């Protein structure tokens, strides 16, 4: 997995340029959600689980 | 904007490597959603405005 750590703090949906949901595969074994900040094109990953991201897909 | 064009027709959830979802900015008035392929190069966007994306 890319993902080394998974960050539970919410985005800021304005913020955020682009989200990458990477289903679960062979080479990973769970799904991975990872955000690209506009700030200064930070990645981060996000919680599949959490609300605050279940939510973050349904606005979007 | 980088899709062109827009495709109503569902992925196979099996053949998706992954999918980018890219908010409206002052660069493209609309979200673009681009789904990866394992195979093939193949990327496909596809619709917003669909619930079965959403699938």
Not at 14 to 35: D, G, M, W, Y
């Amino acid at each position: 997995c890319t993902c080394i750590s998974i960050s539970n703090q919410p985005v800021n949906p304005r913020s955020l340029e682009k989200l990458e949901i990477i289903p679960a595969s062979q080479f990973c074994p769970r799904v991975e959600i990872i955000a690209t900040m506009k700030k200064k094109g930070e990645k981060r990953c996000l919680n599949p689980e959490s609300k605050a991201i279940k939510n973050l897909l349904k606005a979007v």
